[PDB]
Amino acid sequence: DVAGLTPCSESKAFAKRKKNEVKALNKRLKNYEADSAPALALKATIARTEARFDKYAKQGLLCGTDGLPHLIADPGLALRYGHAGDVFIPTIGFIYFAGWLGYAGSKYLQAVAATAKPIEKEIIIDVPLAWKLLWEGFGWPLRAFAEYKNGSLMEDDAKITVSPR
């Protein structure tokens, strides 16, 4: 319980929702054979639905009055009540991958900017160089922090074009 939320394990609405979904799937399954293709597909869907509901209830997710899982997006609140995998951990994972792609693109652009013909390098990508920079982008946090503390990650305001006010 965080904000009046009940765990999905003890939520009656959650169980009723699972029961209703499985019931609808079985109702659709009743109009087929026992080993036909549609019957097997419906059985697989039923198994997946049951596994999903069981996993959600076992993972400790919080359910509201409507019986659906709710996510806690607040450090500390999610860390002390065991909900860090809702938004905190996904935030870290995203930030890492997003920074990886961004750093790889930045390095490729800066590397090809020194070539005699950079526009062609932009429309016709250098596959080996792009591959090497994509691999190097995995250490983007360390490289970015080093460049920031080094002062080479920024451009002087006096060297950037600006409008005549």
Partner 1 sequence: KLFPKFSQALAQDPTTRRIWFGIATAHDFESHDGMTEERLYQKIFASHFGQLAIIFLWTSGNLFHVAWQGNFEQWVQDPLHIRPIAHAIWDPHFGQPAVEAFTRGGASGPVNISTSGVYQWWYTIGLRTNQELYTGSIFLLVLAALFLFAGWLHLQPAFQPALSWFKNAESRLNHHLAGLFGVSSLAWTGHLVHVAIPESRGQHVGWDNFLTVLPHPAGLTPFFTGNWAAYAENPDSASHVFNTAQGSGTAILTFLGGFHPQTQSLWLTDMAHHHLAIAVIFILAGHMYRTIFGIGHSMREILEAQTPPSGSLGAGHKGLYDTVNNSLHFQLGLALASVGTISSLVAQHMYSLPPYAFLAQDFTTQAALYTHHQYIAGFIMCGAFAHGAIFFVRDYDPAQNRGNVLARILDHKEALISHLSWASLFLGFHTLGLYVHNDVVQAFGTPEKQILIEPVFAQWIQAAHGKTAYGFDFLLSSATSAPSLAGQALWLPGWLQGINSDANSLFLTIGPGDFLVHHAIALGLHTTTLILVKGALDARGSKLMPDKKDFGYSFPCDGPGRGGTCDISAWDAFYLAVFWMLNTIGWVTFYWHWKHLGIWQGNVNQFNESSTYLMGWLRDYLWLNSSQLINGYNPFGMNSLSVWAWMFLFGHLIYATGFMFLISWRGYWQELIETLAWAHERTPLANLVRWRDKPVALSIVQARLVGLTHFSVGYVLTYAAFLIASTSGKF
Partner 2 sequence: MKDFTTYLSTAPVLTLLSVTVVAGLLIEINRFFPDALIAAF
Partner 3 sequence: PDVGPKRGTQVRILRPESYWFRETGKVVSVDQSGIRYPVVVRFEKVNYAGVSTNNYALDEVVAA
Q: Which two tokens stand for residue 109?
A: 């652009």
In the list ligand CLA, partner 2, partner 1, none, the entry touching 114 (Cβ below 5 to 8 angstroms by class) is: none
Q: Is residue 73 part of the contact set for partner 1 (CB under 8 A)?
A: yes
The interface with partner 2 within residues 19-58 (CB under 8 A) comprises 48, 51-52, 55-56
Among 59, 67, 81, 99, binds partner 2 (CB under 8 A): 59
Q: Residue 159 interacts with partner 3 (CB under 8 A)?
A: yes
Collapsing DSSP states into helix, strand and coil, what is residue 56?
A: helix
By the 8 A CB rule, do 107 and 144 touch?
no
55 binds, among partner 2, ligand CLA, partner 3, none (CB under 5 to 8 A by kind): partner 2
In 3D space, the residue among 110, 112, 101 whose CA is nearest the CA of residue 140 turns out to be 101
- Report which secondary-structure segment, H or E, holds 15: helix 12-29
Q: Known binder of ligand: residue 80?
A: yes
The structure tokens listed for 59 are 């993972």
Which helix H or strand E contains 53, and what residues bound it? helix 37-58
Residues forming the site for partner 2 (CB under 8 A): 48, 51-52, 55-56, 59, 61, 69, 71, 85-86, 89-90, 93, 122-127
Binding residues for chlorophyll a: 74, 80
